[PDB]
């Protein structure tokens, strides 16, 4: 998957967007450049052997919205190195860098029932203590959880489910 | 549900929805023109791609074909319904008879029996063949391997062992044709039908004709039938027509599966792939498998990885030499390289053990003299060294034997030799009881009585 080759570009675009105070636009800009990449006929062209420049200028034409001389030049760089199919992974990494820089985390919370909201006030206040970041909740109701709740944040998990605790107990043959 | 996304030789990549990706070793199915093709799943790549081997010809496959996900491994008929019929790797009937009256089907991928289940046995099994049960005798429930190069006698020897063992034995038998000649499958089938012994034998054939994927899996189809008869509590004979072809079909696909080459270009998994097959061919406290395997030796190189790995798996090993076979001594067994776990004074007893070690000592000493003799000639030897040579040459000739299956070649009638006659015979030669007979007297005579009658007419 493209993640490893997308990292160098994602940093440079975010760094540049910080200097020029344009991070929001750049996000909405990369969101278009990723989406044109997903179109079928455009995809065929990208898998083709068109020389970089001829590929780039035919891409840039479709990406009309792109800020000329900044967003459009970022395409020319990626076209020299044939990374254009990585654009969906150059985005999202840009969003990750942004969320780190804005000291903000999406955190997820999965339970047998819709949580009581008052509980979510406690959970968010706890997560803002566990991690020194503002925490957006987007919790879920799930049938698999017999009772209780899972808290998931980045790649750290705190299982509070009865499902997990039974299958944690069933372990001791 | 799936889509084909690459086709590289025998290997096909299929994409599935990420909620639905097939397990490893699942069977998939795809329509290829006017026939159905099965694919077996080997690896899960990322992103719902899955990499598979075609159980049939992959020519005419397009990209973008729709693939059906069967929820199970390759499963084959087992039990008495298979007896007397010829079946394919997929467990399909290949004789022109009707469908197989299966009651049960078993997945060809299985775990070996646990360490607690295994059983020991020391019951010596007799053979017709002077050199084999003298030099490398073997037990009921053990494994035998015939190692040799191209054209040395692996099949003819296995056909005598079938004739001798599998007709004085009373239980069922399984013969697995793995990457060998189709003519020899047809020749075998008939003489089984002409002898009316066919109804005790299940036959599975995956000959060289077939595409890689067939030659790879067909050995496991054969074991899975033999494991049903063993677990039923029977004593079973399993014959494998060439085990080397299983490893070679792994080599052919391994690069297309994206695995770095090892050693002499073999797959890196060679020892695990061989071991996971070999560990299933074991006798157990519930029931027994006696096994004979032919083992082709590429370029006669016994130090090649594929022979070298096979040697640790087996209880008796008989090694066939092109250098002997070009003398026309048959069976072309090398007694200085052939060996068995059963050549032990406790199981064989002392007379047999002493006779075998005497023969081994004289023939070794003859190898030590041959480099002197080649430059100097024999006249320079000592008068005891000349007696060692004069005996060793008689020993080499007396290891020769007429075979009932070989009558079509030599014309001469075959011989079955009791173990007692072999020990008595070789013990007499080494003691010098026969030092007055010519060498020609010993070549291709069944028993030592027959050497002295041949000597009267020279």
């Amino acid at each position: 998957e493209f993640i490893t080759v997308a990292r160098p570009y994602a940093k440079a675009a975010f760094d540049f967007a910080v200097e020029h105070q344009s991070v929001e636009r750049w996000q909405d800009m990369l969101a278009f450049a990723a989406e044109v990449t997903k179109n079928e006929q455009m995809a065929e062209l990208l898998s083709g052997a068109l020389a970089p420049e001829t590929l780039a200028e035919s891409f840039i034409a479709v990406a009309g919205e792109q800020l000329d001389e900044n967003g459009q030049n970022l395409i020319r760089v990626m076209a020299e190195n044939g990374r254009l199919n990585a654009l969906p992974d150059v985005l999202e990494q840009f969003i990750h860098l942004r969320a780190v820089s804005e000291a903000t985390a999406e955190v997820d919370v999965i339970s047998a029932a819709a949580l009581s909201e008052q509980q979510l006030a406690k959970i968010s206040a706890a997560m803002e203590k566990r991690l020194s970041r503002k925490v957006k909740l987007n919790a879920k109701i799930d049938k698999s959880v017999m009772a209780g709740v899972i808290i998931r944040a980045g790649d750290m998990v705190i299982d509070g489910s009865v499902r997990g605790r039974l299958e944690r107990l069933a372990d001791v043959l | 549900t799936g889509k084909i996304v690459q086709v590289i030789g025998a290997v096909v990549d299929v994409e599935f929805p990420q909620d639905a990706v097939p397990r490893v070793y699942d069977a998939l199915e795809v329509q290829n023109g006017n026939e159905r093709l099965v694919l077996e799943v080997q690896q899960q790549l990322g992103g719902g791609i899955v990499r598979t081997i075609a159980m049939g010809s992959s020519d005419g496959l397009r990209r973008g074909l729709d693939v059906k996900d069967l929820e199970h491994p390759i499963e084959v008929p087992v039990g008495k319904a298979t007896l007397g019929r010829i079946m394919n790797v997929l467990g399909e009937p290949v004789d022109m008879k009707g469908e197989i009256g299966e009651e049960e089907r078993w997945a060809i991928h299985r775990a070996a029996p646990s360490y607690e289940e295994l059983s020991n046995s020391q019951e010596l099994l007799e053979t017709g063949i002077k050199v084999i049960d003298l030099m490398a005798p073997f037990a009921k429930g053990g494994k035998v391997g015939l190692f040799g190069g191209a054209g040395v006698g692996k099949t003819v020897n296995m056909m005598e062992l079938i004739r001798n063992i599998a007709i004085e034995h009373s239980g069922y038998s399984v013969f697995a044709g793995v990457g060998e000649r189709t003519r020899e499958g047809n020749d075998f089938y008939h003489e089984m039908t002409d002898s009316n012994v066919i109804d005790k034998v299940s036959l599975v054939y995956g000959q060289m004709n077939e595409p890689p994927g067939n030659r790879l899996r067909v050995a496991l189809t054969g074991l899975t039938m033999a494991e049903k008869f063993r677990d039923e509590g029977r004593d079973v004979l399993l014959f494998v027509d060439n085990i080397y072809r299983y490893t070679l079909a792994g080599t052919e696909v391994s690069a297309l599966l994206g695995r770095m080459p090892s050693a002499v270009g073999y797959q890196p998994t060679l020892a695990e792939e061989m071991g996971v097959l070999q560990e299933r061919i074991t006798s157990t406290k519930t029931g027994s498998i006696t096994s004979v395997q032919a083992v082709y030796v590429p370029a006669d190189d016994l130090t090649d990885p594929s022979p070298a790995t096979t040697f640790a798996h087996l209880d008796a090993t008989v090694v066939l030499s092109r250098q002997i076979a070009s003398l026309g001594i048959y069976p072309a067994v090398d007694p200085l390289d052939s060996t068995s776990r059963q050549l032990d004074p406790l199981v064989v007893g002392q007379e047999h053990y002493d006779t075998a070690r005497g023969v081994q000592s004289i023939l070794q000493r003859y190898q030590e003299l041959k480099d002197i003799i080649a430059i100097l000639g024999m006249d320079e030897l000592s008068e005891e060294d000349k007696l060692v040579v004069a005996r060793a040459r008689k020993i080499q000739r007396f290891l020769s034997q007429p075979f009932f299956v070989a009558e079509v070649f030599t014309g001469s009638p075959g011989k079955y030799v009791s173990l007692k006659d072999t020990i008595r015979g070789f013990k007499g030669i080494m003691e010098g009881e026969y030092d007055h007979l010519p060498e020609q007297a010993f070549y291709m005579v069944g028993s030592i009585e027959e050497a002295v009658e041949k000597a009267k007419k020279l």
Partner: protein, 52 residues
Amino acid sequence: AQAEIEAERKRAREELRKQVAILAVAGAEKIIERSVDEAANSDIVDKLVAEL
């Protein structure tokens, strides 16, 4: 031959332990799910957010 049966003794005990445990937790899943309560569910959350 006698020491063999006192090895066999331990094999028979351990196999029965395995049986009763797995059928015990299979019962426990049915028993606990049917006995779920919203105050008890809230009390799970109220415990873990106190130590988290």
